[PDB]
Each structure stands twice: as C-alpha cells, then as structure tokens.
Design a protein around this ligand. Structure first.
Ligand SMILES: O=c1ccn([C@H]2C[C@H](O)[C@@H](COP(=O)(O)O)O2)c(=O)[nH]1
Ligand SMILES: O=c1ccn([C@H]2C[C@H](O)[C@@H](COP(=O)(O)O)O2)c(=O)[nH]1
Lengths: 300, 312
C-alpha cells in the first residue's frame, strides 16, 4: 500500500544514503537532510500497517491541541501518557512531592501515584496538570507585543472557507522569542493548506523527525488534521505532503526498522467522523477507524 | 547542468500536471502544491543559464537585508529598483512634492501616454534626488516591509530583541549537530496588516562533514519571475553563513507550497525550456571581513555564461 511504501522509501533512503552523526541526545543518528513524502488521503487514512500505530493516542492528542486545553487530565482520561514526564518534572520540584529525588523502581511507582491524583483530585489537576509549552497554544493562542491574542487556526478556517485560492494558508508553531526557554521546542514548525477541485491539502514542515518513533505518529496526526479542517470547511481531502529537515533514524533503531522493512502491508483503514458538530466540539468518540489491520508493535 | 535541470523539471512538471486556478491577483496560474528541489553547491553556483539572472540584483538585495538597512539609496547605487514603487507612492502624497498629481498611477501610466511621460519624468528626479541629496534620502528612502527585520530584530511583549540570524550563526559555531537551526520570517501577529506577507516563511541550516546546507520553505513561488532569483539568494545566503561559520557549502534544498507559473508566462517558459545549458559559474568571496561588513565589490562570479534575459 502507498502509505507504507512512502515510509518504507524514506526508511530505505536514510539507511542507504544517510550520514552518521552525533545528536543532542548522545545516541547517534543516521540522517538525511531534506526529504518529501506524499499521501493521497482519498486512498484512505495513512495509519501504518507494517507496525501498529495507535489511533487513540494520535486523535486524543490532536483534539487536545485543537480544543486549546493545556491540562493533562483530558489526556489521562483516555490513558494517553505521552506528556506525563513533562508535567511530572514540575510536580517533583514543589512543596507537594514527598517521595525520592528525580531507581527505575521508584520513579515508575511515583509516576503512578501522581497520575492517580490528577484524575481523582480536580483541583490538584488544575494545579500541576497544566503545562503550557505545547502546540495547542501556538495554534489557537499567540500573543503580540501589545498583549493581543491571535488565533491562527480560526483565521485559516475562515480564509480557507472564503478565500480558498489564497497561498497564505499558513499556521506557524515557531515563536523565535520563545525558543531558548523552551523545554523541547517544536518539531513541527509550520504547515500550509491548499485548495483545488473542492479538495483540501496540507503540507507540513518538520525540522526534525525520529523516523522510527515519531514520523508514523506525526503522519497520522497531520492526516487527521487535514480531515478535520476539511470537514469543517465542507471540503474533500486531497494530499498530505510531509516535508522533513533532519530525518533521522536513531542508532538504537536500525534493527527495529530492519524488522519493519521485511514486512508486507495490509490495506489501509478508512476514517469516519460521525457528527455535524463544529470540529472544536468534536470528541474522540466521534471518530472511527474502519478495518485497521497492522502487524504487531516493535520494541527498543 | 544539474541546476538548470532542476529548474526545468519544476516547470516541466507544473506545465503537465499543474492545475488551472485563479489567484489573488486575478491573473490565473497553473499550480502544483508541494515540491522539493536540490542544488549541490559544490558543483558551482546556481545562477540559471537558460536565462540570464542578475547576480547584482540578488546580492545587493540580500546584503541590504542582512545588514539591516531600511534605505533604498543603497539599492539605487547599484541600479536595484526592486523597491522603487513604494517609495514614490509615499513621496507623491507628501506636501513637498511639487509635480503633477501622481495619484494612483500605474494602471494610469499604462492608460495615459501623456501622463507616462510626466510619470517617468518624475520618477527620474525622485531617483536622482534620493542619490544626490542625503537629506532627501533620509526623509524618503526608508521603509519597514522587510525580511531583514524578522531575521535580525524580532521583538516580544517586554521589548527584548531577538536576532535570529546572529543567534544561529552562533549556534552553528557552537552546536553544529543541533536540529534546531531555524530562522523564521513569519510573524503571524503581523500578517493581517503588512504590505506583502513573506513568501520565504522560514529556513533551516544543517552541518554534516564540514558542510553547511540550507532548506527554504517557500509558501508561494512565481516559478518564472521569482524562483530564479530566489534560488540564487538562498544559495548566496548559504555561502555567506558558511563563511561566517568557518564551514564549506553543501546543498540548497528548496521546498514549495504553491509553485505556480502565472498564465502570461507560459510563452516565456516555453522559450526557456527549449534552450540548452552552459556549465554553471562559481562564486568567490574576496574578503576576510564579517559577512555583515562585506560589500558587493567583494563578491565575484566567475565564468557566468548564459542565454539572453527574457521578460513579461
Ligand atoms: O512529534 C515529534 C516530536 C519529536 N520528534 C523527535 C525528533 C528528534 O528525535 C527529537 C526532538 O529533538 P530535537 O530535534 O529537538 O533535538 O524528537 C519527532 O520525530 N516527532
Ligand atoms: O521572493 C519572491 C517574492 C514573491 N514571489 C511571488 C509569489 C507569488 O506569485 C507572489 C506573492 O503573492 P502571494 O503569494 O502573497 O499571493 O509573488 C516569489 O515567487 N518569490
């Protein structure tokens, strides 16, 4: 299938022509700079079949960004943990955390009890569960000097609806004045929407991509985004175009990738949004992945 | 050659599978959305050869951007007229313009060939006076609608300034391997008011093996008029930073959102596509100064042979 094939190409290319380099994580990567993939969303939803990718995690995180929630309770409600450490690293400093300094036994335990309290205590949730360092902010809430809030996402839905032909369907997630502070500054620096023959397309620019762990996930995020915008502007879906800067496979992943590349695909699933509510009122329950079949998951 | 080949393919592809659409200017284009071109800078410097491109215009614009000069007197010394319209318009509104009402000209200059004589006549003096009277230049040479602003001077809520260019040059020096070498021109809080929202929304540097690469995301591209110029800016920009950072050049990677040939350029493209290439030129930079202190004189393009210019 074309989606898997696209990604298999990228994997293959990086293995063949990539350059061996050190990285900030001291893991080492084999890497290529600049690369472009395409995905026809008319051929279904591009959730990889040669390795399980979790629609729940992807859809939950993305709706979490688009709702402009910065509070990890919503994520925990669905058992999405992705952003747990980021918030834990705040909990551990304060006049609340009364456990060991932040062995693998203890942390693992201590993560649990934290998670516990964010769910069960509402007001402890508001307390620590609200990290603010995310995409969800950059999209819906960007500040100018004079304290005005801009909302890139609303604006582009209105400009797509009433001036489709424009070439300024841009959403940036890169604030130059917020980088040096940033926990982990964005990998998805900005994206662009395009409209032709009633079809919407999206190109993303990812400055930095972990091919084994991140791409598959992100591909799914940006495919789902398109679909959402598309539906909200009453359009059909076109392509997602995925542009990379540093596309890298970590050295601890070569085998994991090798195993993957030796697997044959299944047909891709399809996606249903079962509602006519504004996509900012859309809940995870309103999304449906039909006949998703994948080979099981691979491990680091 | 590989550079012309790359540019040709783009045209070639757009012409074939691009889609008829209407645009903001009501000119109509044929457009593809999503494309990526590479240019190996070790092979030479990518001034197109199937059509003459003015290194002078390219380099003087770029040096002007990166130096943070807001004043077009500089541009005019090199016969760079890229920004002469905005400047005439302000002037001819001011009360110390004592020539004929040049009110909303252009449509009106094409229209009326007695006026066009007065128009060309007045532009010639404005231009001459910008060059000859520094006073007059200070007071009428000076804009704000610029890429250099965002590269060099991005201000936050509290009035701290962030100079991206200089920050990445440092970060390249101290942390080549970082995947965070980013310079952005897209300030969403300002997009709704400004004259011409940047087409070059952002770019990224990369270091491998003593070599600096650069990828440009261009959200919009006039394949015919702008791209040949744009290729050479970013190529020059790759050299300049590589030199400030004590590195050699690798590749220019060029990504596009809306790559379009405007409807009235098909004719021009067709002629160009029919021509054959010369070996590309090379770029020497003849100075050991900071790139912010470097002058157009210090640049040298060597062995540029190309077919004649075209226009539309
Ligand atoms: O959505 C994401 C987020 C992160 N990463 C990867 C890219 C890098 O491996 C790492 C971020 O590190 P820097 O590029 O910031 O060093 O995580 C992704 O691939 N996708
Ligand atoms: O460096 C540049 C500057 C402008 N343009 C072209 C692209 C568009 O045709 C037009 C900009 O108009 P919008 O893309 O904003 O509609 O100018 C370029 O190709 N390159």
């Amino acid at each position: 299938n074309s989606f898997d094939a696209a990604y298999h190409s990228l994997c293959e290319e990086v293995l063949e022509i990539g350059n061996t380099r050190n990285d900030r994580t001291n893991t080492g990567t084999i890497s290529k700079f600049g690369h472009q993939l395409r995905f026809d969303l008319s051929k279904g939803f591009p959730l990889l079949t040669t390795k399980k990718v979790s629609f729940k995690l992807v859809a939950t995180e993305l709706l979490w960004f688009i709702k402009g929630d910065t509070n990890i309770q919503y994520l925990l409600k669905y058992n999405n943990n992705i952003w747990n450490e980021w918030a834990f690293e705040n909990y551990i400093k304060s006049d609340e955390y009364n456990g060991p300094d932040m062995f693998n036994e203890q942390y693992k335990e201590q993560m649990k009890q934290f998670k516990q309290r964010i769910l069960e205590d509402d007001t402890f949730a508001k307390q620590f569960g609200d990290l603010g360092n995310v995409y969800g902010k950059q999209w819906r809430d960007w500040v100018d000097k004079d304290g005005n809030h801009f909302d890139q996402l609303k604006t582009v839905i209105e400009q797509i609806k009433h001036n489709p032909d424009s070439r300024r369907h841009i959403v940036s997630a890169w604030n130059p004045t917020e980088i040096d502070t940033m926990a982990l500054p964005p990998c998805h620096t900005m994206f662009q929407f395009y409209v032709q023959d009633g079809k919407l397309s999206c190109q993303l620019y990812q400055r930095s991509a972990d091919i084994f762990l991140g791409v598959p996930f992100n591909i799914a995020s940006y495919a789902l985004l398109t679909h959402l915008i598309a539906k909200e502007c009453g359009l059909e879906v076109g392509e997602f175009v995925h542009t990379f800067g540093d596309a890298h496979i970590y050295s601890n992943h070569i085998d994991a990738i090798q195993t993957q590349l030796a697997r044959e695909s299944f047909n891709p699933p399809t996606l249903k949004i079962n509602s006519d509510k504004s996509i900012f009122d859309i809940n995870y329950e309103d999304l449906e992945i039909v006949d998703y079949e994948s080979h099981p998951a691979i491990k680091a």
